[PDB]
Amino acid sequence: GVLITGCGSRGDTEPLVALAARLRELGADARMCLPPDYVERCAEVGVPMVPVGRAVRAGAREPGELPPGAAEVVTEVVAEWFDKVPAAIEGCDAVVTTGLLPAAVAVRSMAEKLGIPYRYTVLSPDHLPSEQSQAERDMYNQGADRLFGDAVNSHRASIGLPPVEHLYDYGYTDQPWLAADPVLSPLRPTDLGTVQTGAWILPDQRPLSAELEGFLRAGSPPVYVGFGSGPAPAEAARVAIEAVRAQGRRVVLSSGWAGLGRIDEGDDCLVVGEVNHQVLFGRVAAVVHHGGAGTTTAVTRAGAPQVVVPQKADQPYYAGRVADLGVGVAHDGPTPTVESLSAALATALTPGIRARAAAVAGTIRTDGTTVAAKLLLEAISRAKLAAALE
């Protein structure tokens, strides 16, 4: 089998689920360890998953309950991953991981004990160890060793392993994969070591809800607005609904983890939970979003013009890429006004940008999980998987 693990928000998780589902399609018994947020997501695509640790979404936790990334709970997190992974990693021939470092180091430790290959994956080029300075890598290593090195080493001893240090190097490896689209996120030409697979995208077969189908059929193509797993700007729903209205468009408002909702009873608005983005984004006039490596990839592949309203990370990088590609607008700052979002939308709603977005869509590959599957085949070899890829 193959074990796939991670701890993070939806963007850290969805690519992993994509890889797991692809591996199962290719005849490999891929299974996962993920935070409990993702139970429904894995089940609906037929991927076995073992929940590990605290929920990542605040609203999924108890009041006052700290997130898995909180420094205060790191000892517990390390213990939990060492407790729950052994049953899942049994019978596995390789492990692929992204996300939270203390969890990743626990997972690599268990891979090391079993003598099976471990691969870490990053989702945007700026996160590659080789894109950090030496001083930065030193700093990350020292921080990790100091914060949770003792806990990791205690659990390593419990399974007979020697101590390890430089936990950033250890968790990320010396050459993590880059599961990111090369058009959207180009890798510098001098980097020969990084394997850039393309984004890991699950071909989404889920139907749209009856309510969303009805909404789409009942009028002109709407504008989607959503902020994904992350925070939304002050007055986000009001500003976005009013700005979209100003452009003579209907609104699909994704509640997201921020829990956005309608501002009135207007029938020109539909509030949605989880949706099939691949399908929906082909049926909207534009997408206002946080940029989100995964969301940006989905929008770009769907060919919808964009307004990127970056909040944190990472996200300003994607806003800039979208603007550079000419397929959308990089909103100036994290907090739109009705005026600023209206202006950005007007630009994103031209026939020209529609054509540009349509063209760039065809350049975005969706077979990154097949590249990853082949990489796994070669790592394990050094059966049904070789046969399926042939």
Ligand SMILES: O=c1ccn([C@@H]2O[C@H](COP(=O)(O)OP(=O)(O)O)[C@@H](O)[C@H]2O)c(=O)[nH]1
């Ligand atoms: O209703 C939704 C919300 C999210 N996604 C997918 O979840 C991923 C979110 O990726 P991103 O990197 O933007 O994650 P975030 O920053 O929101 O955690 C993308 O593949 C989205 O298309 C989806 O299919 N439907």
